[PDB]
Design a protein around this ligand. Structure first.
Ligand SMILES: O=C(O)C[C@H](NCCN[C@@H](CC(=O)O)C(=O)O)C(=O)O
Ligand SMILES: O=C(O)C[C@H](NCCN[C@@H](CC(=O)O)C(=O)O)C(=O)O
Ligand SMILES: O=C(O)C[C@H](NCCN[C@@H](CC(=O)O)C(=O)O)C(=O)O
Lengths: 497, 497, 497, 497
């Protein structure tokens, strides 16, 4: 059965990234179902630690660990086993009273705080991976468009000429700092609260560093109150999502204006556009607007979480608002969609060049030229070029048809004095590509400086990938350490005891 | 004329920190008036750079710099000179057409972005200084209360025994990570956008690194669009303020509950409390509630700023919302007030000990004891102690009057089986100080572990102060470099030219 | 399998209202699945209108209507048919090309705006029903507690004596105005945008008033742009939810303080409390804190929706954020939970009376008494009673043990003058029940005035129920009109054509 | 000294409404200074009531009232007298101990709640007046543009043809419902809490209805707790401001796109545009973007206020966030600015008509035409017209140059079948003015239906003005009643006592 929205001008299939924006809502897990796999990992890690600490015998531990695998299997289909106390009771029904001993020195409070960290931890690595691929697509696009001259806007008005690659590298610098945020946050998520128990620790001699290590954490939440009352990392995760998505919404809005029927300087790839059921001419930026929607929605969890922390004491509280999987899924779907929008965007290079040459964004360089040459104050040159533009628009003269006559008229009419400049001097000031080439300092649109930025961004992207690989592998290693420590306790009880 | 609110039970004067909460609103500068001193610094730094770059002569530059000092003096009383173009025109009226040349290679867009960074930069150091003193007061208080036994709450219900010092060190760990946020943000605020001009750079050969260095920045905002469109640091500044203040509100709320007529476990210092004009018995937590008010209000700028970024393209925009001085002033006033609240808080140590011994927070250790000794599942011990508590409350027996009889009744009535434990075994489980001493792992309330936390926090506080001192001095040095470079250009033109 | 959380002090089953707070998240529909039943109603209403307008023949219409029933049945299990274009294509696969004619003069834009209104419309009536039952429970509780003397707090400090019924009638007045909000909003939701088509109307001669009427609306969204661009009713719905829930959170917080181990003036019904897996003494206010959580979370949709409207033009937009079913379900679950909390709350009337008599909330009436009798300024009487309290607390004298001696000491020590008042005059001022009875003006706690409020609230509740019944029946009538008009078109084509 | 921003293309002076956006921040009062005039009115009204109730003698009252006038005069310059207790003490210093008697039966809590209502009350009438003039300007503009054909957009893409007047009447309908919100809110602000005293009423026999009436209120906040704890009207005021401004931001954004260099379909009046200090071509929409800024900022108070209510109990609290004067001033400045933007907007009627005729917004009517004539399903006609557009764009044929050949090609190439339609049949479908005229149902762009909307809006505007006039006069009357009652008490004590 075909995608019924792919009709008329909406040709082909939705891009996969584009379809993600339609799928994430229905597919999102509840927080309970997203967190409960991490609970099972904590039960094993905690039990292993109790066995290493002699709080449980190798035989008690082996019994418990074999039962966890059993109840985990029941929980795959019995949703009622995905919260702790029902899970513990099922373990009791499976292996007997020894079940209860897995909760020695532990509470639901530090179990939940830890388990949710492990969830957000994986979702932070998932996010960094998405943002990295988004930066990768932006920089790779920029490298193909060092010569694609076009205007930059301020206040939605044409400002000066630049290049598409220069613009995209603004986004790259935006994302580099957002990746810094996500990495700095990871250092605060990946702290282990286990061992705080309810909020006050316990008399049982737990090895907190061992449980943290077996679960992939890079350190402890030390104080036990902070272990169960700490929630700022949830707030912060919501914020970084919000602010990163605000930049994604601004790129989305920028491309949507580029691709208006009126600008006509870029077109969405067919695979990232839809159409109307009533208006056959529509090529609709559904991917852009659903991506912006995610950015706006991301405000919600941020405010909900912060409101809830402002509402309580510095205690464990069940009143605290969570960052939900469906919010993070929205972020990933939008980042993926915009990664593909950027990769496949089709700029109309000739119309871009047309505006830059015709619609007066080169007037700064005409002004700079009078100052640099005839050496008048920037404020008097400005009034002349301003009158040049006023007169040009009245007479219907595009900026690239402005000549020595008009600049002389304006100079005379505004100062009673002509100006010593050549027709060539003027034509060169109004050449939008020359406007670009003159702008060659750091971070300016001249190809040589943009390419420099690209080289630096490509080196940072390598650092970005290496950081992610390390973080990811550090978790895979602990997770395999834990799995092995579990098979040991179990397999020896079976064979030699 | 005396403070008319200091009547009846509101004895003495408001503490200075307490009074700050009443003064910051009326005293707050507008953003314009707060930023315009930093504009004047940029004019000099920019001019100095133009002179070093030979874009201005030592004589042109000296003229301009002497005029800046003149217009700066006019602006001290003429508020209309605190935005750029009126300021530039006054400079023109002062020194002539050469005035206009200070704007060579520059825009209002990168001037404003840079100037607001310099403002927030100083306000970030001001904030870190306040938070540091807040952490200093919290840790110093904790060190005096390692023996002050009291209950910790979860869900506003007594949970287990701890100490006041253990609690305060939860706050210390909260603030350590908030100081990390503020420091990580400083690295993104202290980037120089100057040289981006409108958004596209310029053909003038500016030395961007020189202007950044003369203005105290630690690096550039490289890409020129990012220089004027970048606003995430404003968003982030608002967030860190919001989340830090959320923790301050939770401490404020905690102390307000401690100091209810019903808890009666702490009392605000007279200098941090008010009273009623109608109810003479009132000792009102005005300092706490006005501090919470600041935390709630801090939500506003955060949402306003993020909404505005979600509303635009990735351009310069005058639609962007700012972080205002009056919001930061509120944060400082509240941090100062709560620093003083904590320093001067008066805990009722006997009532604290009373609750911990009488109101059943020791029941965990009774349960742990049955498991550790008679070696029953935690879930069956739990039902017995739960019935102990149920029976205890019915009969009016406080937890420290619970004895072997009652635990035997409960065990029998719940399992038909007695339990091998001594009267001493039970009295020791219900001793709340022994509850503390047994909780001696990392981050738990036992004095030895809390003291450990304190030693670590004191070492971190030293690192905190050293980071602040370095940041502050790095700005004082650039500011004196700049001042000297200005007096040079001026004094030599006068004497040798 | 029993509820594994019902252990120790958590006796019996969760109340149904209490369990609702655990069930709503997993059970919540997506917006798509919640809205698509209303889409099917619009297809019939629209078709019926086209048939009445002769845009379709009784035979074309009958074919279409019979097919809608068929595809509706397919959609019960095929989730992909719950968005329009896939639904339309299935109708085509069912009845042929005539399927497409149901979209004559219509768009997805006005279909969606209308369908979401019909969804929120039903959810508004559902909400008003919940709030009504919440007000019913509050007033009914108040009527049973006109004599339950207790203190009112300001700033979490005991202020003056009142009654529990007086307090609950503050909530009643809060809810009356929230019901006004919900009713005023209903008048703006129940406007029909159908006939706006994409945004500009259509050349087809639709009878817009007929479609509105067949779908239960009470009027049109007239202008066609406003029909598809209008979203303020979604914003407003989110706000009213937010502000109503803020009051519910304040009652929840109030009861949670009443029921602290320290206040001890109210206890949650066993069926609305939980306990700890580690701490057997816990009677945990899980119902209160999960209700507050809903209130905080309700901030999110409000901010998301408003951000999205601030981000666009006054057009149809797919970037707009929605009010989701899971948010409304949270509101209903919390309103139900707190309805049951209030109905079943157990106040400790003796401890309430104890505080009112012992903890100095009667000092206002002692002050008022000196002014009313010995006729001194309220400010000098205030200083004396304030010193009475200061001295009383030092010496350990509860307010009901304050006598003529102490008031004489304070008067002398503060003014060198005694005061002509009797031991009876003083004992009467400090009688907290007499404090209540003297407060007998409108809205004050004296039984006679509270009962007055109750009578008025009971009359308003009758108006509240009657408004709801009318609104609900007006929709049931249109829905049966529509069903009948459909069976007519279908059954006559079958028999007489 | 001239406005230094009025240079180059920024000709003439800023419009007054435009300048308002630059002035409101520095000029905004603090809440304290904005509310304290209303405090003085309450002192008189309260005293008058006490005198009518015989709680004060005509001589005591006359003394007090004469002193209020004296301290009010001191407060004009002594800012420390603008909070109650300092004010009361100054009254004591002026007229003696009788000063204190003005606080009989009263608190700072119900004084402040009432005084802030009186402030917001006046600011609500001020807002309704601004919004009315904004609607007046929108409707009056629409009446001049029934023939100004132009395209409507959905998703920032051209949708169908309409008229500028049709668009503006969408805004009118938006504002009508926002005026309903403001009026419904006024009924909840204009309730008098005075007589609640601290929260529990008083034993003094106050006539609450008299004080309410003397102060212009239309009813009581009955319950005394609700009188000091009630804050939802503050929340709601913030929301209505937020949602109304969200619509103003959407109009602002719409006009800013119209007036891009690329759309070129409208131009801001010179008096509502600025320019660049560096780019002489800029005509900058500073008025639009500063108006949007206000809309975004208005999110802040809304979230702050709601967070604070979610953070407390249902008590008086000093933690509650306020709606500040500077926020309301921003709203008024933005509403005024956009009122003037709309009044003076210059549409380019020829370019508007050009797009409507050339850029394919008429394709719906071509599709509708094939269905209405050759009588094919809307879905097959849609594919043909879609291919017409695809082919048209490839060959460079504007929609008004589409002819019978191209529609035949598309029909054949898509169905192997030609189509019986005339060249005239097609040219008429593609005539954008005929597209308008055919859209003549309710709320559609045809002149006759828009004019209908205008007539209805003009009648509503009359109702809007009459409601405002009544509300305003009802306050002026009470205020003069009060002034007269004061001069009576004073002038008779002087002459006959
Ligand atoms: O004073 C009373 O009549 C009643 C009393 N008011 C509590 C709040 N007092 C301060 C708060 C502040 O200084 O921020 C205020 O009235 O502004 C009470 O309820 O105890
Ligand atoms: O059901 C809920 O929403 C809350 C529930 N209990 C919260 C409190 N936990 C225990 C500690 C414990 O059970 O180990 C405590 O602090 O009293 C939950 O854990 O989800
Ligand atoms: O008045 C305002 O709110 C905005 C005003 N101008 C914004 C745009 N700036 C220029 C560049 C320039 O002037 O150097 C541009 O981008 O067109 C302001 O600068 O505050």
């Amino acid at each position: 059965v075909p995608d019924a929205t792919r009709i008329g001008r909406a040709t082909g299939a939705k891009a996969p990234e584009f379809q993600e924006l339609y799928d994430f809502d229905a597919a999102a897990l509840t927080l309970t179902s997203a967190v409960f796999p991490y609970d099972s990992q904590i039960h094993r890690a905690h039990v292993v630690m109790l066995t290493e600490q002699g709080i449980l015998t190798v035989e008690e531990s082996a019994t418990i660990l074999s039962g966890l695998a059993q109840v985990d299997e029941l929980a795959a289909t019995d949703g009622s086993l995905r919260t702790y106390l029902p899970y513990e009771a099922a373990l009791k029904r499976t292996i007997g009273s020894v079940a209860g001993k897995m909760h020695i020195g532990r509470s639901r409070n530090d179990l939940a705080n830890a388990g949710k960290r492990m969830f957000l931890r994986d979702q932070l690595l998932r996010t960094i991976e998405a943002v990295i691929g988004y930066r990768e697509a932006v920089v790779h696009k920029a490298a193909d468009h060092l010569d694609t001259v076009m205007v930059v806007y301020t206040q939605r008005k044409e400002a000066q000429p630049i290049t598409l690659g220069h613009y995209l590298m603004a986004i790259s610098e935006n994302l580099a700092k957002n990746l810094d945020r996500y990495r700095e946050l990871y250092a605060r998520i990946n702290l282990c609260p286990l061992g705080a128990a309810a909020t006050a620790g316990t008399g049982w001699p737990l090895n907190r560093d061992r449980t943290s290590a077996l679960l992939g954490f890079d350190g402890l939440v030390v104080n036990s109150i902070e272990g169960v009352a700490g929630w700022d990392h949830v707030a912060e995760h919501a914020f970084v999502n919000a602010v990163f998505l605000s930049g994604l919404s601004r790129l989305a809005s920028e491309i949507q204006l580029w691709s208006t029927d009126e600008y006509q300087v870029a077109e969405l790839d067919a695979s990232f556009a839809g159409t109307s059921s009533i208006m056959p001419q529509k090529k609709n930026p559904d991917s852009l607007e659903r991506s912006r929607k995610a950015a706006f929605a991301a405000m919600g969890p941020l405010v909900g979480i912060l409101t809830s922390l402002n509402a309580i004491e510095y205690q464990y509280s069940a009143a605290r608002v969570e960052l939900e999987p469906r919010s993070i899924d929205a972020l990933i779907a939008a980042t993926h969609a915009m990664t593909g929008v950027v990769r496949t965007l089709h700029p109309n290079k000739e119309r871009m060049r047309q505006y830059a040459a015709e619609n007066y964004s080169t007037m700064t360089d005409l002004t700079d030229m009078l100052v640099r040459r005839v050496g008048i104050d920037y404020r008097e040159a400005h009034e002349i070029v301003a009158h040049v533009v006023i007169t040009a628009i009245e007479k219907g003269i595009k900026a690239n048809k402005i000549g020595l006559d008009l600049v002389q008229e304006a100079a005379v009419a505004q100062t009673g004095a002509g100006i010593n400049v050549s027709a060539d001097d003027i034509k060169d000031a109004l050449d939008p590509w020359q406007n670009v080439l003159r702008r060659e300092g750091k971070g300016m649109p001249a190809p040589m400086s943009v390419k420099a930025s690209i080289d630096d961004a490509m080196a940072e992207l390598h650092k970005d990938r290496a950081w992610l690989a390390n973080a990811t592998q550090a978790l895979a290693n602990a997770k395999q350490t834990l799995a092995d420590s579990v098979q040991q306790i179990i397999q020896t009880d079976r064979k030699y005891l």
